[PDB]
């Protein structure tokens, strides 16, 4: 059955957006092990003007100078009663965080897994870098058969890596 690209203001659309290596790695040692300008631009194009929800460790991985990310309501998930995020809201659950009509979950590994049962869209960048999975890595969620996907062709980044975009939807 079909979904619409229009977001009625009384609904709670939840999407996830992440960049991964072909192995599924999204993070290691509290950082993202690549930077692709095309991915950075794409991330801002999708999320700008909406609420973004992130795990506390993803907030930590943002340089202090740049957070909160501008042009978006920044919401941070933490179970620690004394964690604070200057300029942003800290909430203790996904239920508290998903109050906007359109919310983009922007990481990390734990929060993607937490948010997936409520999500109806995923926007994925795949980077053609040979990074094998190591213990402790943050990993992308795996999408079951209820998701229908559009896979873009391989493109070439100014930074010299191949990459491609996926768009997934479900009802
Ligand atoms: N490639 C990408 O697209 C991408 C995007 C974003 C981040 N990343 C990377 O991914 C890594 C971070 O991912 P991660 O999995 O380690 O952590 P995370 O998902 O970003 O954040 C984990 C934290 O979220 C909080 N949390 C988790 N479940 C919760 C729940 N049910 N209710 C409330 N709070 C909850 C906890 O904070 P407390 O411990 O404070 O309770 C937990 O420690 C970093 O390397 C980052 O750079 C990659
Ligand atoms: C761009 C990576 C990415 N890509 C997709 N496709 N989805 C995501 N969720 C995603 O992580 C967004 C959150 C992590 O952002 C940072 C991590 C460390 C340092 C700086 C930033 C800010 C970014 C930057 O300037 O690199 C800015 F562009 F947002």
Q: Please state the structural category.
A: alpha/beta
Measure the end-to-end span: 7 Å
| Large-scale geometry | globular
- Small molecules held by this entry: NADP nicotinamide-adenine-dinucleotide phosphate, the ligand CCc1nc(N)nc(N)c1OCCCOc1ccccc1C[C@H](C(=O)O)C(F)F
Compute the number of strand runs: 11
The largest pleated sheet is described as: 9 strands, mixed
N-to-C order of helices and strands: EEHEHEEHEHEEEEE
Work out the helicity level: 10-25%
What structural keywords apply?
monomer; 171 residues; alpha/beta; nine-stranded mixed β-sheet; two-stranded antiparallel sheet; binds NADP nicotinamide-adenine-dinucleotide phosphate; binds the ligand CCc1nc(N)nc(N)c1OCCCOc1ccccc1C[C@H](C(=O)O)C(F)F; DHFR_CS; oxidoreductase; NADP+ binding
């Amino acid at each position: 059955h079909h979904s619409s690209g229009l977001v009625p203001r009384g609904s709670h659309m939840v999407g996830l957006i992440w960049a991964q290596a072909t192995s599924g790695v999204i993070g290691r040692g509290g950082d993202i092990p690549w930077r692709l300008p095309e991915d950075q631009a794409h991330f801002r194009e999708i999320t700008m003007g909406h609420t973004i929800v992130m795990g506390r460790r993803t907030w930590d991985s943002l340089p202090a100078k740049v957070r909160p990310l501008p042009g978006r309501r920044n919401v941070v998930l933490s179970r620690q009663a004394d964690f604070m995020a200057s300029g942003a809201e800290v909430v203790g659950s996904l239920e508290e965080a998903l109050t906007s009509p359109e919310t983009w979950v922007i990481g990390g590994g734990q929060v993607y897994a937490l948010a997936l049962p409520y999500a109806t869209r995923c926007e994925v960048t795949e980077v053609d870098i040979g990074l094998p999975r190591e213990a402790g890595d943050a990993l992308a969620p795996v999408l079951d058969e209820t998701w229908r996907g559009e896979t873009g062709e391989w493109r070439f980044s100014r930074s010299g890596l191949r990459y491609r975009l996926y768009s997934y939807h479900r009802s």
